């Protein structure tokens, strides 16, 4: 009951905040060490927020062979306890 | 987490009162009572009690701020251990008949835990020590029962393994605890404890001996070995010390070297010179262990462990003079070592449970964790 509909990367506003507006207003260009904001859209309403938050994780990979040893792959949950 | 100790106002009293009530109920259901040498027989157990309480309570009070806990926790441990050892030696050797010999043997079983606890004192609270006492007495009784079943020896005579069992149990439990010092008045009180232990240790080496000449020779050998070990330990402490000074802490543990080394063979040594040689060799080995063991947590318990192993080895050497028995005795030793290590591991993983409210690793060796002191902020 946590199906994703679409994800808005909010390229224009994040690119303005990250001083990458001159690059694009459609592709997300972000500078490391600065927070950027995305919007996650669900297919159906989320009844209970906390168990749904426990069930979701995000992963960022770069390159063709991402690995945790190369720091090319990272897996983090969605929580207020995350390391900013 | 919170370094301020959690309240034990509901854990410690409920735990202790439940233990005491269970002991009372078991004593009612299973224990029973029933001459010329009543006082003489009482004297051996009384010497054991004096050693267990006083010597083993004050000997580990050398800590600048843990002397209260050392002495009082040793008293509590002895009081619990004697009762539980009475019940368990009754259960694993047969209704339980309480004689003075049974109380003496229960005191020996409690002394095993009291020796083991020196490796963990300052890093545990009272409830963890209760768990240690119960599990260690159970393990020692199980070891004696297993030896009696396999090697067809008497259950009470298997209690000669208690030095090495206590040493390895204490080492194994201390190894499982979370990881992290001396004053002058605390070191003097500890000398008092060590002196009482050293003076009455010939009673440790002959409580289980029935023949009067065997007790004669055992006490003589222990007395002379302990004298030689005192001389060797006090004089050789300067060599095994970086600043070439005598260490009170080394002397406290190493004075017992001769008594430990001849404990299993004091009744087999025929002449006092052999006991003196064994005491001298034990003192030299104590010096070497002080000079080497810290290189390769408690150094005094490590040297006690190596001394107990040496005592068992010299038992093996001397028993041949007085090759299948060699194999059987090495097997008994190895079984004792394995059971001590396994039970120490079990106790260590039991003590690491969060429910015991163990002190924070920054609050080790501090009486303020367990005791009331004036002019302190209490609570939140």
């Amino acid at each position: 009951a946590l199906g994703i509909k679409s994800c808005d990367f909010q390229a224009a506003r994040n690119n303005e905040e990250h001083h990458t507006k001159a690059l694009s207003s459609r592709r997300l260009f972000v500078r490391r060490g600065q927070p950027f904001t995305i919007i996650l859209y669900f297919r159906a309403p989320v009844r209970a927020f906390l168990p749904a938050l426990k069930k979701v994780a995000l992963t960022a990979q770069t390159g063709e062979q991402p690995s945790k040893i190369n720091r090319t792959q990272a897996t983090f949950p969605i929580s207020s306890l995350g390391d900013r | 987490s919170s370094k301020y100790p959690r309240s034990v106002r509901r854990c410690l009293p409920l735990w202790a009162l439940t233990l005491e009530a269970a002991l009372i109920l078991l004593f009612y259901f299973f224990t029973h009572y029933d001459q010329k040498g009543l006082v003489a027989s009482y004297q051996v157990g009384q010497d054991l009690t004096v050693m267990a309480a006083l010597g083993l309570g004050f000997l580990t009070s050398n800590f600048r701020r843990h002397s209260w806990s050392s002495v009082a926790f040793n008293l509590f441990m002895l009081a619990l251990g004697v009762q539980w050892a009475i019940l368990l030696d009754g259960f694993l050797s047969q209704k339980v008949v309480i004689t003075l010999f049974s109380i003496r043997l229960a005191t020996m079983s409690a002394m095993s835990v009291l020796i083991s606890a020196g490796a963990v004192l300052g890093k545990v609270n009272l409830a963890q020590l209760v768990v240690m006492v119960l599990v260690e007495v159970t393990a020692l009784g199980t070891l004696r029962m297993v030896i009696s079943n396999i090697f067809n020896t008497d259950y009470h005579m298997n209690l000669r393994h208690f030095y090495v069992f206590a040493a390895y149990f204490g080492l194994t439990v201390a190894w499982c605890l979370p990881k992290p010092q001396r004053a002058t008045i605390p070191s003097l009180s500890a000398m008092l404890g060590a002196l009482f232990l050293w003076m009455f240790w010939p009673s440790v080496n002959s409580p289980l001996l029935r023949s009067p000449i065997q007790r004669k020779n055992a006490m003589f050998n222990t007395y002379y070995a302990l004298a030689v070990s005192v001389v060797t330990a006090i004089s050789g402490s300067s060599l095994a010390h970086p600043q070439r000074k005598i260490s009170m802490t080394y002397v406290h543990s190493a004075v017992l070297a001769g008594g430990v080394a001849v404990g299993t063979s004091c009744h087999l040594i025929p002449s006092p010179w052999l006991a003196m040689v064994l005491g001298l060799v034990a003192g030299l080995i104590s010096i070497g262990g002080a000079k080497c063991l810290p290189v390769c947590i408690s150094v005094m318990h490590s040297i006690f462990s190596l001394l107990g192993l040496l005592g068992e080895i010299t038992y093996i050497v001397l028993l041949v003079l007085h090759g299948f028995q060699v194999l059987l005795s090495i097997g008994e030793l190895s079984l004792a070592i394995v059971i001590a290590l396994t039970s120490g591991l079990l106790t260590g993983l039991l003590l690491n449970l969060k429910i015991w409210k163990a002190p924070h690793v920054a609050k080790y060796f501090d009486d303020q964790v367990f005791w009331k002191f004036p002019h302190l902020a209490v609570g939140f």
């Binding site: 927020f49 906390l50 929580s79 306890l81 | 301020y4 920054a362 302190l376 939140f380």
Partner: protein, 161 residues
């Protein structure tokens, strides 16, 4: 129920549940039967992120418990170095006195929390403030044998903030 769940989440460090409760309308200044709010519990348990988040949502920093202890008092008694640092960084009064006259410096000194003692001294804690017994942090550290705290208190002297 909602306030109790919020306080339990603050004690356990569950910042997501506490933020959910604050979103649903739970008052941030609610306290338990001992007068301890979420800031006090988070300071006790060393939950730095929860402490910072609760400070952002306008919790009253100088709220005392039924014993008169502020969050800084509790963090000093519990020896939470980072929580003490953050509470001071957000303007906690380092010279606050409880009902019996204890200061955060006194609680840090009596518990042999050398880092908290050093930080409090560097932030202008006055070690001449006595309790109702007339005891100073130096006196209680001398009584309890905290030799490092005694040495640091003597060496600092009156260097101030």
């Amino acid at each position: 129920d909602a306030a109790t769940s919020f306080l339990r989440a603050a004690r356990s460090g569950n910042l997501d549940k506490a933020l959910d409760h604050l979103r649903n309308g739970v008052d941030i200044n609610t306290c338990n039967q001992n007068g301890l709010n979420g800031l006090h519990l988070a300071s006790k348990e060393g939950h730095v992120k929860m402490v910072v988040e609760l400070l952002h949502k306008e919790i009253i920093l100088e709220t005392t418990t039924k014993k008169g202890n502020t969050a800084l008092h509790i963090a000093a008694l519990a020896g939470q170095d980072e929580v003490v640092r953050e509470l001071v960084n957000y303007g906690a009064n380092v010279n606050a006195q409880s009902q019996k006259g204890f200061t955060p410096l006194y609680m840090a000194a009596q518990e042999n929390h050398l880092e908290v003692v050093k930080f409090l001294l560097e932030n202008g804690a006055n070690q001449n403030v006595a309790t109702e017994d007339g005891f100073t942090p130096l006196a209680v550290a001398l009584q309890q044998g905290h030799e490092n705290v005694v040495a640091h208190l003597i060496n600092y002297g009156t260097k101030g903030k």
